[PDB]
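Progress narrative, Year 2. Work on Endo-1,4-beta-xylanase from Bacillus circulans advanced from sequence curation to structure prediction during this period.
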Amino acid sequence: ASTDYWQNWTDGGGIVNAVNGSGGNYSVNWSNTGEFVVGKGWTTGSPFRTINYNAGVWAPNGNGYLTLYGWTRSPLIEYYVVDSWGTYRPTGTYKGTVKSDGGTYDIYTTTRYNAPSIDGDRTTFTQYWSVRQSKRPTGSNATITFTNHVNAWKSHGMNLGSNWAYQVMATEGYQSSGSSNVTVW
Ligand SMILES: *[C@H]1OC[C@@H](O[C@@H]2OC[C@@H](O)[C@H](O)[C@H]2O)[C@H](O)[C@H]1F
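Result:
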């Protein structure tokens, strides 16, 4: 599928050189950053979407995530399906696990306080995560069958909102440097 949304958000810290590439392709080259999230995908997310990507470069130097990323409203929820990471593997309150696309992912909830969101600069909101139990190899085509994650989240009382906001395949970083290159479809 063609992507129609370009995500390029930095909290202003350090350098985030994000290149909006041909089609579904993008790169990020980052240096000593605050928090940032860059990626490609769709203006309207869906729990029924299938997301494919190929990460031709995955070279974080420190804390970075290669991750499906998006939001809902009613309620406001920032969510992740993390397939690979740098030095830090993101964890939180353990809920259970889900098998999807040849991987097994731990399921977590965390909360952010006084943090940027789609609806304000100082917001408190829940985060939902599926984090793969081992890093997914990169450089071959990969698929995130997101309905498998949504259903698993539901089966643990993690209910997404009714009003879907954007949904991308992202590189997110904090307090780190590195390079990524990702094609999404
Ligand atoms: C999850 O990722 C980073 C940040 O989300 C951003 O909030 C500001 C909004 O304009 C952007 O669209 C988001 O990427 C959020 O604080 C963090 F929890």
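Helices lie at 146-155. The domain at 1-185 is CATH 2.60.120.180 (Jelly Rolls).
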